[PDB]
Symmetry: C4
Subunit: 108 residues, 4 copies
């Protein structure tokens, strides 16, 4: 029931979820290897080479919880502003991990 959250001081990345910009350090994304955002191989497709940011044309009220999963170091909880289906599709897209997906489902 306890998780670790990254402390500041290195490299900061900007994630643009359909106009909503999110800024986090790379160490936040590197906490969880695998996943769409964890490794550069599965996030090079969504990286815009000109704006120096990651663009996702998806629901913006969900990346608040998706980002907090990396920040909180494992706390995945759906905010009560979006349906369960929408968040399930979002977490399936971001590939948070089979164990994490099952844990979230059992928490719902």
């Amino acid at each position: 029931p306890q998780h670790f959250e990254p402390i500041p001081h290195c490299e900061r990345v900007v994630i643009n979820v359909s106009g909503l910009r999110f800024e986090t350090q790379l160490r936040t994304l590197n906490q969880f290897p695998d996943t769409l955002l964890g490794d550069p191989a599965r996030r090079l497709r969504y990286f815009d080479p000109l704006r120096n940011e990651y663009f996702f044309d998806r629901s913006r009220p969900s990346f608040d919880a998706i980002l907090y999963y990396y920040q909180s170091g494992g706390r995945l909880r759906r905010p009560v502003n979006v349906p369960l289906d929408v968040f399930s599709e979002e977490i399936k897209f971001y590939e948070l991990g089979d164990q994490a997906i099952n844990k979230f489902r059992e928490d719902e």
Copy 2:
């Protein structure tokens, strides 16, 4: 009960809903012909020629659901932060389609 969401790679448009900026690809808006945002004829009035963006002086907490309708490929659901009257007026303004309007009403 299933819908299709656009995949990334072309042209991206900025929609400014009373200060809240939304960025989506043109393919997201072109999923639904007709509608205010689907075709250029009904959205040239709201396009600002100088800022290169679409300005709508309306309720900003509703275009989250309006935009997701294009992103989710047909999923129109009202977020629980605005009343049914406000969202009904918004969807009537954006002209989401008589079938879509009736489907949303029967879902409420």
Copy 3:
């Protein structure tokens, strides 16, 4: 139970509520004379002469409803993300009008 919302085409003003920027036309603000935002006399104090915007160091989740009152042409309603006390203090500060204040109180 019916209200009128301004149509687009003149001058647009930016209202910065503690970092959250809101853009509306003057016709939206001029719908209600009196009030803090309706007349230039009661909003010159909060106007930043350098950034060409109005700054209010107040709760940002309330100006969504405060702004919609001008947009919707008289529809004042508290969103369910802030308490009644906070919204009452906000509407008292913005001076929405004694009749409007009483109408909102009787609607709560």
Copy 4:
């Protein structure tokens, strides 16, 4: 049951909570000495010297209440969009004060 909120006119600071920018006057932060944001000693670590802003890689839906605590002059209350578990860790990080933390818990 009454609190004082700062009036405008001096120095304004920008707080970037994981991409979400908050702007407040320094007098808002100086209302409460001690705390992470009250004194420069405990906020120099989180100040970005290049962007001239304070960066916190934490949950952005929680700093609305943390900022309002300084604005409202002592009104600390968790918005109903984030869990009590998440907010308790947030207020502990910002070190709102031993009396204030216990007051919030007794209010929950």
